[PDB]
């Protein structure tokens, strides 16, 4: 948010700086120092299944996506520890034809061996919002059912 | 009937070597049957989960 005189936390004109406490406009913090950290990938209904192209970061930790309630907790996670940094791991939650393959050039490699048993507690996404684990980038493509349209 | 390999050809014709003329050739030279391998690793293969590289 902006920094304005007098509605801000700052000390500002005669020296040695003055904050004033009123009613209502008083002091509010214009930010966070480095906001760039924040970062929300908001779940507003419930899907049932997605195709993401996750990008890792660092090779030999564990590599992938958790997901989280309304009140912080976690539900389920689908997450792998491969040997060396795949280019992305392209991860397929359809039941019909599920997959699991990790990319490293022109080869691909199935990952559903190397990937974290007790954390993939469910398929089906509820609300509240995702988390990056060792990813650097990652690319979504989620789908959602309606009885009629 | 002679076959000679490692052998000038005049006419660009006379003695062509095959890929197997050669593979036999090889294979007296190291002293190796169809049982064995010459194998080197030159850079160290690589192991990603269940798979080999």
């Known amino acids: 948010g902006k920094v304005i005189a007098g509605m801000s936390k700052i000390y500002g004109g005669t020296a040695p700086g003055n904050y004033k406490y009123i009613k209502g406009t008083s002091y509010t913090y214009y930010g966070e120092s480095d906001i760039d950290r924040l970062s929300r990938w908001d779940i507003k209904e419930e899907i049932f299944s997605f195709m993401g192209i996750l990008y890792p970061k660092l090779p030999k930790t564990p590599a992938g996506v958790r997901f989280l309630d309304d009140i912080g907790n976690e539900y389920t996670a689908i997450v792998f520890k491969t040997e060396q940094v795949q280019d992305y791991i392209l991860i397929n939650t359809d039941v019909n034809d599920e997959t699991y393959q990790g990319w490293k050039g022109t080869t691909a490699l199935n990952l559903f061996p190397v990937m974290d048993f007790e954390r993939y507690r469910t398929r089906i996404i509820e609300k509240g919002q995702m988390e990056l684990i060792n990813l650097s980038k990652a690319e979504f493509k989620i789908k959602r059912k309606a009885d009629f349209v | ?53």
Not at chain 2, 3 to 17: I, L
Not at chain 2, 20 to 28: Q, S
Not at chain 2, 29 to 47: A, E, F, Q, V
């Open chain 2, 1 to 53: 009937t002679i076959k000679n390999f490692t052998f000038f050809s005049p006419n660009s014709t006379e003695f062509p070597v095959g890929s197997n003329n050669d593979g036999k050739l090889y294979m007296m030279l190291t002293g190796m049957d169809y049982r064995t391998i010459r194998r080197k690793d030159w850079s160290s293969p690589l192991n990603t989960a269940l798979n080999v590289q």
